Amino acid sequence: TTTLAFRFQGGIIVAVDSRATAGNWVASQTVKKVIEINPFLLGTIAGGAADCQFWETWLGSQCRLHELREKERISVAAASKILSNLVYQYKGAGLSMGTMICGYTRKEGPTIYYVDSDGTRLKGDIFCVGSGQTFAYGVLDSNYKWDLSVEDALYLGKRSILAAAHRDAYSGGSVNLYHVTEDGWIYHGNHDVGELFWKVKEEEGSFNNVIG
Amino acid sequence: MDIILGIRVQDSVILASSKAVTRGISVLKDSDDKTRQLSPHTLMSFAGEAGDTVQFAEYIQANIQLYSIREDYELSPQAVSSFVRQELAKSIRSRRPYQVNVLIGGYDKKKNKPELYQIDYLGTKVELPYGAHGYSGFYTFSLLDHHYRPDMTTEEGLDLLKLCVQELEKRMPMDFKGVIVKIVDKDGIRQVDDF
Amino acid sequence: MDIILGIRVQDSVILASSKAVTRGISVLKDSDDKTRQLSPHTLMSFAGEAGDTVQFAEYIQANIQLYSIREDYELSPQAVSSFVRQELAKSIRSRRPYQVNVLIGGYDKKKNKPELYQIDYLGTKVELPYGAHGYSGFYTFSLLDHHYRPDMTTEEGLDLLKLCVQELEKRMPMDFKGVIVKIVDKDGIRQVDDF
Amino acid sequence: TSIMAVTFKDGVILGADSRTTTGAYIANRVTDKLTRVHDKIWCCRSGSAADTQAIADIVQYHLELYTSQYGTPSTETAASVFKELCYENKDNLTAGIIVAGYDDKNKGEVYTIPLGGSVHKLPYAIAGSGSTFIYGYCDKNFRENMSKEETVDFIKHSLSQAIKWDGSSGGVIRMVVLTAAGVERLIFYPDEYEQL
Amino acid sequence: TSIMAVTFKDGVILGADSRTTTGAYIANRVTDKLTRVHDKIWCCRSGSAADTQAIADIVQYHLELYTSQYGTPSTETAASVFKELCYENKDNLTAGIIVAGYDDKNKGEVYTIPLGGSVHKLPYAIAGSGSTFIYGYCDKNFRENMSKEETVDFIKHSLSQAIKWDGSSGGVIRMVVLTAAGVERLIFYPDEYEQL
Amino acid sequence: TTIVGVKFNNGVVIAADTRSTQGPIVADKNCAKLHRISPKIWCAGAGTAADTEAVTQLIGSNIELHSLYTSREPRVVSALQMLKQHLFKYQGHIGAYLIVAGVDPTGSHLFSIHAHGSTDVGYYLSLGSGSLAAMAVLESHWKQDLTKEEAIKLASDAIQAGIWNDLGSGSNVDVCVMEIGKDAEYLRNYLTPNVREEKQKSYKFPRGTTAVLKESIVNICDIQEE
Amino acid sequence: QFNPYGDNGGTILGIAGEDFAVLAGDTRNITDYSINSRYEPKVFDCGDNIVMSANGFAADGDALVKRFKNSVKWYHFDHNDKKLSINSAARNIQHLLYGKRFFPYYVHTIIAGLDEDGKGAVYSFDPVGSYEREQCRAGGAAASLIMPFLDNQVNFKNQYEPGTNGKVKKPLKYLSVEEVIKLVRDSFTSATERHIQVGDGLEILIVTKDGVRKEFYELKRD
Amino acid sequence: SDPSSINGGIVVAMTGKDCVAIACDLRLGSQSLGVSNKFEKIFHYGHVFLGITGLATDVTTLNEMFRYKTNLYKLKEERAIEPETFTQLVSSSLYERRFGPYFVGPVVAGINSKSGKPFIAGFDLIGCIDEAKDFIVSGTASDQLFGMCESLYEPNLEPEDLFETISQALLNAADRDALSGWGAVVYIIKKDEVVKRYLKMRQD
Amino acid sequence: TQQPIVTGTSVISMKYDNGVIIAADNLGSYGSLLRFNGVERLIPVGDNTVVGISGDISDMQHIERLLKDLVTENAYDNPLADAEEALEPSYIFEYLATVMYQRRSKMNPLWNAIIVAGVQSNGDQFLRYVNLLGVTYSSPTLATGFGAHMANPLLRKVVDRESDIPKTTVQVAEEAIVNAMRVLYYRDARSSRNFSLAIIDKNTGLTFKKNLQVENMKWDFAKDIKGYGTQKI
Ligand SMILES: *[B]([O])([O])[C]([C][C]([C])[C])[N]C(=O)[C]([C]C1=[C][C]=[C][C]=[C]1)[N]C(=O)C1=[C]N=[C][C]=N1
Ligand SMILES: *[B]([O])([O])[C]([C][C]([C])[C])[N]C(=O)[C]([C]C1=[C][C]=[C][C]=[C]1)[N]C(=O)C1=[C]N=[C][C]=N1
Ligand SMILES: *[B]([O])([O])[C]([C][C]([C])[C])[N]C(=O)[C]([C]C1=[C][C]=[C][C]=[C]1)[N]C(=O)C1=[C]N=[C][C]=N1
Ligand SMILES: *[B]([O])([O])[C]([C][C]([C])[C])[N]C(=O)[C]([C]C1=[C][C]=[C][C]=[C]1)[N]C(=O)C1=[C]N=[C][C]=N1
């Protein structure tokens, strides 16, 4: 798994891979690793598939109950802390989860919280999570600026997942892109790595190691 | 030891190796050179278990230097790398194997080409445009996949290497106290004293 | 987390805590504040197992803030430290203990004295002129044994603290990405933004 | 431990050695392994001394309370109470018990209850570490409807051999006779049974 | 496995069941555990089939070479060669062997060699997993200087009981008679010995 | 694996299934488990495939040299002795479980061998994971004074019981008949009761379906003249 | 020590058509190297035009199916005989599975049917409740043998159009019910050849707007 | 830990009408880390082709060993070794390391120069010969390859048709294995010409 | 979690044209010791069902009491207890299967393998298996323990599939069962010669046969077997 999210001028970019494995066996190439919590909240998922799906789907129910009770959308901080407090109750039981809770509010602005099944909860500008996180960090850190266009930021996120999809054996399949703004998240398509790799190689002039 | 990197450009091979030596909770030294000159146009960097690394490197060095005197001739990097691989492949089924990973950077004077070989302690040899051992590759291969172009100059290679070291210094937990960089080309081996 | 230091001088208590957060082979963050304000004149830094540290610190914070509202009065650092110790002493014989070590730096407005308390996860409390948790003390206590004087100023305390951090940055293997320094005195709590 | 119970014409006879061991040390050489849960319902105990005592004490309590309400219990009923304790607490118990009793209606009966907690009604039963060495002898020499004197000799000869070969068995041979006549205790010393 | 050797007036008789087991599966129901190391020196085998075969084959080789140089070996000598192999390789062997032979000078002799590799000269011997169940029976029923017919009945009755109680023992009862007259093989089938 | 051996009037027959397995996967569907030690001494092997092959070849080789040395046709007891002593020395680590059979100047013989080096004699024997299914058939249908035709039938039926009921055994039935005063006849695939049915569809692709990057001729020939 | 889990083998296969769906599974049931039954039904009609199979440990498999059938029954009682849609069934099954997160049902579950637009639907589950809608999925012992074949022959993976040489992919034309059944039969015949726990018989359940139909085919019994 | 799945990789071989085909992926990794995408696993000694999966150091070592032995064979015999004979040499060589084996899954492929008969064979790590008529599979995606071959394969395929079948068998099997892929090579072998084709596949 | 102490070995069974046959030996083993020689392991329930049990005997006796109690409970407030609302084999099996799976789910299993044989109200044959894990399956032939490995192969030669059931008579079916019991006595080291057999026919009802023995055994060939290879005498 490789998932990333970073804050920038035009809000937040979220990018994830699509692969699921059981040992060396490739179980799925079409996994949805971004969960649409509401029109303004996104959750990435890494680690145990069931743990992540169940509890982030559950998180959406808790966030919906909040805005029914409080007549106001839940903050990214509060949404992330509901999940982190939940997994903390289960600490030691063997849950396996690594997530970014990404969203935008008026009071907070664009916010990213990393939440993890050990109980860790961290606010930050850039995060990469999963088995291929180090590969994503390499591309992301060397090319990141606050002043990036929506178009350039989206490509950087896409390219960082591609890098990890290539090198990490347990990452791959396809790239799902999201862009979170003042007016909510925007989906930017499924990008198959089998076609994206050759496209990027030719146009960018990268991956000169590989033959094509 | 920790981090060793290698990159083969147009007309040279550049090896970068960390300076830190850590035993337990203390950094005993911050200026350690994790490499040995096997021949005038062949350099080997190394990392692995304490003691084994130097013992192996010097043993290889002695054998290549012996060959050079006997034949009055320098072995090709390919020939040296094959010799090194066989020693490690022999070692892995010994009573106590050499726990050493190496990079061999050399300039072939016959073919006028730089060559980089990555060999692990099992005796797994691969020729590469860029290579790394340990946790280093987990950060650096993605950068090199993006930026590396084969027709690069030595100066462009050093800039690309700086970008790798900066990423390692940002994201790796261990303080490896910077790197010693060495260039291998047609004129021989030299050390970049400022990095 | 890794390194947390504390030093009590003439008229204040200075706490220094590392900024790094490392999960596995990656440094996820380099600006993490490992402390919580329990009351206007009492600060607690913390280090231990992931999740437990923050959960415990915030739980303590909530309890002290509750006391402050109920009585319209600030507890003494000694009183807060005893409360914290009991929670950890209770915790160590639980199903799943809090795996957290803390330093409590406070200024007693009644006695007009700074106070530093070191408490480990077992509930082991000690009042000290200077303290540390984890591997930090193995380097810093020898320096502090030499230089510390009980009548030091706050500026002298910060210089002595810089000398501790420099030694840690030289000899410790892990890159802890510097420290956030906070001062606790009669006027309250403030952060030294440049260190 | 070598224990056995044998039915015969006039009723039933229980038999046992008297050795209790902690490893190779004989903690008690004159132990009484034949114990009373009711007037004419007794049991032979093997395995853990603590477990079998605790069980026997509980059974005696149950049968005493049974008697106060419903009159004298059958031997089958006594065996059932033993079973219930041994079966339901099989994970925590090490008890090999032989239950033997005399009714006027049913006459002499013998029930054996091994480690598992199963119940087996038999003409005669053998149990304990020393019983292994006399399966051959007992099978060849047992007859139904024996006399009192014949049954005493059968038990005496059997346990004598079990004692001879088993280190965990020894001491005196205790016996308890259950008939319409009443309850008789018999004892046989080493000098008597070793020369057989 | 149930094996035994019994000395009597005219010589010695070896006896054995015919069961070989891999756990609870009977790999061979007609096994021959009575094996020849010399004309009138035989052995009963128990434990590992491989180990006891390898041992017996080596002993037969040693006694064949002994005979070529020094003439017919004694039963004691055969037992000593068995012992040497079992004792010196005790860590790697699982072999319980009974050695039995007939000289004209020494007549019938029986030596038993348990796991340790010790040697014990006895009037009769029993061994194997099934022997445990007939210690009582054999001790009570054995006499010295029995006749051939009495000794055959003693072994037949003994192994019959051992087979009855031991799961690892079964099949046919093989016997080998060693006297001055020569070597006689006897066999007894389930229908014969089960009804005893 | 199901292997059997059956004695009859004027000789002995052995048989085997043809399935090899690595875990739950079938490695070979038509495996050859009947090995020739000498012209008229054959043995069926179960357990580790490389071991049964290797141990048979080695003893077969030494049996051949022994036959030439002594100017005599080899005996089954010689193969038996050489096999058991070899296997015993390796303490069961050589995973070969063998049914050894043959005819020689002494007569017809049938033995089994286990990996630890123990041997057994019998008129009918079976080894392998399907030996219980095979032995059930043998114990039900075997009798003394079997003819050649009856023994082949009984042996193949015993293998079939293994093929159908044991998941470790399958595919075909191999047989070898060794009769006294005759050449041994090796019947490879004596029965074939597991032919795969016709597939519903042909998966022949249109030419050019696969994407190619480079092409090149490979030089397999030697260095050329002129 | 007592081991509460076992492996009953078998293999299952779901394929989604344009206006239909199939769920196939072999009828063999095993433990270790023995056959328990040559015909033990594994794919079940659960009502509301939904078919289900829970392959792996049969005791857990039967328990789960039994509990889901129960869930369908109570869904009718509690919600005025409303039809349980395939997506709703899938979510319900996730909660049944995750309910035993710390003592899991040791099964790979697949359900098939039609979505609310009438199109063919297949959903796949892991033991602890993670699920995903798919056009194609094989599950169980021989899943590793069958899935690659389905990637190739159902989704036309690694296939391109002649003449263009790797430039133009093969178009994703839909498959008829007759075409799908051919791929199912060949999948199981191939799996039977190379997997010892697969064989005896093949039972296919086909789901359409008209209802649930069954088809049975013989497989090799060795 | 498990030597046979540290580096990863696969090899497959098939027979056709008067031809054979052998193919392999190009990946070499250290568990999750992909290291090289040029690590070929198919070698040849004269007209006999050998594919080797498993531990990479042993793949290299055995290639060097069989090059060594086939060269000495050729000097003494004054002719190239044939596939049937080479198969025996591989088996012998592997079994001599019975209790300290090379962690490999070799595959032999070639056409007998005298008879013209197509030949393929597979081995386990200690030397057992699997001489199949149809196809041989080896490596970390052997299960996947078995499934593909058993369904896609038909006998007597022409060289250019056989290429499509073996290529699709390899590619789709590799795509369901995490430790296989990163490129692929296919050898089409006829009695007196051999074509080598690199396949375009997904690079993840 | 426990370990089985006193144990019963194989239970074997098969369907025939008008009903089902089931059999099991009368032994209660204590490890390698053949301790108890008079144990009945076939337990009838009514006049239409027989439950055959292998494994732990103490647990068998518990199950025996549960079934005895089931008959009592079914009779309560039930005028049709001996007619339309009598206990069916399918009812008895499902109850046991529920208990077995519940007990394994509490990590405290009944250490048994059970075969419920009987005939339903409509004359249909019932034969189904359940064990300590709660695993269930049905087949024309069913067997537990060693029976699975040795009996099934023999019984499957008579009834290989469903269509062979109407072609199989009670005489042929009983003959196959009795033969299978002999084979088990040859080859199972924890079996006995004495056994019980039960037939449940839709016409002639429940026939329970006690004190049967394995007969017509082949042992004569043993006399010719000498040594383990080279030995002649
Ligand atoms: B990713 O690699 O973390 C990925 C994300 C998940 C949401 C699909 N996880 C998996 O693929 C895991 C295995 C794993 C690999 C590497 C690190 C951690 C975990 N697989 C599963 O959770 C899974 C679930 N069902 C079937 C197969 N695999
Ligand atoms: B007998 O040996 O089984 C005997 C019967 C007991 C009721 C008096 N049991 C013991 O002696 C046991 C140990 C034991 C030995 C052999 C088999 C089983 C158990 N001894 C004790 O329980 C004991 C010993 N020392 C002090 C207290 N209890
Ligand atoms: B007997 O049970 O001791 C018997 C004697 C042997 C010489 C024929 N031994 C065996 O049956 C042994 C196992 C064993 C059982 C009981 C006690 C000690 C040992 N069996 C084997 O050696 C054996 C079994 N199957 C194949 C090969 N060898
Ligand atoms: B049979 O199942 O005993 C069979 C007989 C063999 C001699 C042809 N054995 C095998 O098929 C063995 C099973 C086995 C698996 C693992 C370890 C030991 C034995 N198979 C192999 O030896 C085997 C497996 N894969 C490739 C080649 N050979």
Ligand SMILES: [Cl-]
């Ligand atoms: Cl007592």
Ligand SMILES: [Cl-]
């Ligand atoms: Cl033997």
Ligand SMILES: [Mg+2]
């Ligand atoms: Mg919460």
Ligand SMILES: [Mg+2]
């Ligand atoms: Mg302390």
Ligand SMILES: [Mg+2]
């Ligand atoms: Mg005594």
Ligand SMILES: [Mg+2]
């Ligand atoms: Mg089969």
Ligand SMILES: [Mg+2]
């Ligand atoms: Mg990848």
